[PDB]
Design a protein around this ligand. Structure first.
Ligand SMILES: CCCCCC/C=C\CCCCCCCCCCOC(C)=O
Length: 124
């Protein structure tokens, strides 16, 4: 995946997920630049779950599949983001176990990624 293909994938994942939820574009803009420092609505949390379901890296219960996420990295991120993404996944592989509710499990995993990344981090 090239960087151009990655940037395109962000918008195509957004376009598949956003229309299923009542969201604020401003909130999406913040997640897109890796800024998760605000209380998410329930729909925003479930949007992060929708995105992760599209990648196949969570199940319906919001449980994160770290082995699958790691194996899928070459298909999800460009080469220049591979090592940073691997370390993010490893740092956050168990985050979901700390929460009871499906959407929140995914949201908190994504927030954990955002805290264990570099400046290349972007969320769809
Ligand atoms: C499995 C994705 C690796 C995330 C590690 C953080 C590094 C870079 C962020 C760019 C990746 C975002 C676009 C890929 C969408 C898959 C999101 C999966 O996230 C979860 C919680 O399953």
């Amino acid at each position: 995946m090239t960087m151009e293909q990655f940037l395109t994938s962000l918008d195509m994942i957004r376009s598949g997920c956003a229309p299923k939820f009542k969201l604020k574009t401003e909130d999406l803009d913040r997640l897109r630049v890796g800024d998760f420092n605000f209380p998410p609505s329930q729909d925003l949390m479930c949007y992060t779950k929708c995105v992760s379901l599209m990648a196949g890296t969570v199940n319906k219960k919001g449980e994160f599949n770290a082995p699958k996420a790691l194996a899928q990295l070459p298909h999800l991120v460009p080469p220049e983001m591979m090592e940073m993404s691997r370390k993010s996944v490893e740092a956050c592989r168990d985050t979901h176990k700390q929460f009871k509710e499906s959407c929140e499990r995914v949201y908190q995993t994504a927030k954990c990624f955002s805290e264990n990344a570099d400046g290349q981090f972007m969320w769809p």
